[PDB]
Design a protein around this ligand. Structure first.
Ligand SMILES: O=C(O)[C@H](O)[C@@H](O)[C@H](O)[C@H](O)CO
Ligand SMILES: O=C(O)[C@H](O)[C@@H](O)[C@H](O)[C@H](O)CO
Ligand SMILES: [Cl-]
Ligand SMILES: [Mg+2]
Ligand SMILES: [Mg+2]
Lengths: 417, 416
């Protein structure tokens, strides 16, 4: 296969799981040979589509798709300004599709191009929630019955607020029932109100209950989701040491990463950070200084497999493990990309997993097999995943803007959500 | 009372031959509107989408007086954040809200911000040329016009020049006498440059310029991330004798840690930051006094609201401001830079790219330029307007630039 060229780049917007996704398909001049990539930044899908269709398409047409790194390095600087979530997702859609094409050319899964299997299956964690400790407990028992050996445990999702916004995970979750928030001022500006201090106090109570009822064999994760002041998060990490979490996630905002210096002087609770990261200057000081135990980047939002590989290696050499973002707002193509990285990384930590519905499996043939808390990738070439464009059209994106991201503390302050 | 945002729209126009994006915010007070700059020229269509599809429904119905609340909630509205497209959408909105606030107050934005700290805004402009003599000739012409500060490049960035009209709406000669290394026997398409041949040429250029022009005139040089960090460090040291006003962008944002080494060794003043989009880029530099001037593109860090915070953070660390002032900034953005400039105690310098008649016609209220200083009008808000019908006569070109495909002699795709 010589004189290989990119012929077309297109964006497919689809929501079979009830959450807006963006997927890139790159066609070549070799009949039947194409690649797929994930560009899912769900809150800005139309702007990602614009970045792909108006900019990436004329940048790529006619170029040899074999040169993944050169295309990545030149694409990243093509607009001069860079290091942002919309830009990165456009590059990710392209980059993953190129890895997909290379694996097809090689007759090899991407995990094989990257050095082959380092494990026999991919251990997963899934989410459990509830309005009180008993409901959280009940949900964890149901997941344990299914074979999950790791679970994230929240009571009232993030900051105890729950969610009524279907744009987040396509399902409503109850506010924490028994958290007594502070009284607000006499008129309130609209928002999703939460009480960071009432939330913080509830977390150790939740884990005390769960450990009493469920024991210490089951692995537990909790996500702070940047909801409290940094000293509150530090105190939280210290009080949770006794409950031996697999990790405590996002104790600080990316804008407050310096505070992890203080956190790591005091606490030995394992820490994860980074689903929000878009810049090397966010993650590099954390990893260089061993201020986290797991890196959490959303692969498409850091620009695809090419940069994720590099992050996985940088973390490896510093004893930091991977925990790629696995929410509902990631396409099955991105779930595959996370998993090809997972299977080939010596320093894989865990794979967050949001279970799919039948519509997702139908629109995307080749979804990883989930069997008793482990994921098993098929051994098909490239990413081992495909998209049925006609079936995708049955689930048009809803578009619009989320409501959950307007988070206000009791006095009405707009807060990092 | 009961003041509300009623409409948010994006205006795309190119009166100076460079794609601009401007946001206009209308309100339920007849005649009362604001304008902001959202100019990220290489991505204008994605910026328009970010504004039209996301900012518009986020804003309509809200009280425009709450600028800080709108900025803090807007910045996190999509969860993910800290990028150039997102920040420019936010800036267009933010600057329009400051404009509206000034119109409500009957005061220029500089007056809302604390009043004038100076009697005019000193400017620098660009001088270029294919050899030292052409550069010198251009500086002399600008000095005759009253400029007391000039940026001096020979072959623009990396010695390569440019043929790409998307960059500044002018072709600039490659450096004539710079002898690049031989490339391999076939070359991947790009704009070729030689960082080593470039680096060696700069002290020769300044030796000539200081000999011919003396040390009264202020000189700026822009490294534009073109060389390895230790080469930039050595360049800083060799340029100390020429007493530059500043040496700009010796490193890429991805290499800011290297300024620790630079600042142990060199006393050439340094500026950084036109590329910055993230607090984690500029905060370590300012906290550790690794730069003397901060160079942010105001719209690209999210508008007047975040730029003011950055100016104060710099002020408290003895770092001065040098807001980005290229051709790819609308006159609304030029005004925003200058309202900050006039109200900041730690103002450093204002980069200025002269406008043509069409820009002045499309944007009534452009700052007066008089013998090397800018003089803002004293009109309320930003003191700037846009004639929409006249803007429509200059549609955007769109497409993609060629200058950002920069390759070293062996063919390596480089940070441009
Ligand atoms: O740990 C997680 O899975 C993340 O916190 C997500 O829940 C994000 O909030 C969501 O992906 C935003 O779109
Ligand atoms: O100092 C400067 O003015 C800059 O380096 C510009 O020339 C940028 O390259 C341009 O604004 C990119 O679009
Ligand atoms: Cl962005
Ligand atoms: Mg999380
Ligand atoms: Mg510059």
């Amino acid at each position: 296969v010589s004189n290989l060229k990119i012929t077309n780049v297109k964006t497919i917007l689809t929501a079979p799981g009830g959450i807006d996704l963006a997927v890139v398909k790159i066609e070549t001049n070799e009949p039947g040979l194409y690649g797929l990539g994930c560009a899912t930044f769900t809150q800005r899908i139309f702007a990602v589509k614009s970045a792909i269709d108006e900019y990436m398409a004329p940048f790529l047409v006619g170029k040899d798709p074999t040169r993944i790194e050169d295309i990545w390095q030149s694409g990243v600087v093509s607009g001069y300004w860079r290091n942002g979530p919309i830009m990165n997702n456009a590059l990710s859609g392209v980059d993953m599709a190129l890895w997909d094409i290379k694996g097809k050319l090689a007759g090899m899964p991407v995990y094989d191009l990257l050095g082959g299997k380092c494990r026999d299956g991919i251990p997963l964690y899934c989410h459990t929630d509830g309005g009180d400790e008993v409901e959280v407990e009940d949900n964890i028992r149901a997941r344990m019955e299914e074979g999950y050996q790791y679970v994230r445990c929240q009571m009232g999702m993030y900051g105890g607020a729950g969610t009524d916004d279907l744009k987040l995970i396509a399902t409503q979750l109850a506010r924490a029932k028994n958290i007594q928030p502070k009284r607000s001022p006499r008129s309130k500006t609209p928002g999703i109100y939460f009480d960071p201090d009432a939330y913080a106090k509830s977390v150790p109570r939740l884990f005390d209950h769960l450990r009493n009822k469920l024991g210490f064999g089951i692995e537990f994760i909790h996500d702070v989701h940047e909801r409290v002041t940094p000293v509150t998060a530090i105190n939280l990490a210290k009080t949770l040491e006794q409950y031996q979490l697999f990790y405590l996630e996002d104790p600080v905002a990316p804008e407050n990463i310096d505070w992890l210096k203080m956190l790591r002087q005091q606490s030995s609770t394992p820490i994860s950070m980074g689903e929000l990261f878009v810049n090397v200057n966010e993650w590099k000081p954390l990893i260089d200084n061993r201020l986290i135990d797991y890196i959490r980047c959303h692969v498409s939002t850091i620009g695809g497999i090419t940069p994720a590989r590099k992050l996985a290696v940088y973390s490896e050499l510093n004893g930091v493990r991977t925990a790629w973002h696995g929410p509902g707002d990631i396409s099955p193509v991105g779930v595959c990309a996370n998993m090809h990285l997972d299977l080939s990384s010596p320093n894989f930590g865990i794979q967050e997993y949001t279970p799919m519905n039948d519509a997702l499996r139908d629109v995307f043939p080749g979804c990883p097999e989930i069997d008793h808390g482990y994921a098993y990738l098929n051994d098909k070439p490239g990413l081992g995943i495909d998209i049925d464009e006609a079936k995708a059209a049955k689930y048009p994106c809803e578009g619009g803007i989320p409501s959950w991201t307007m988070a206000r503390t009791p006095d009405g302050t707009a807060s990092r959500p």
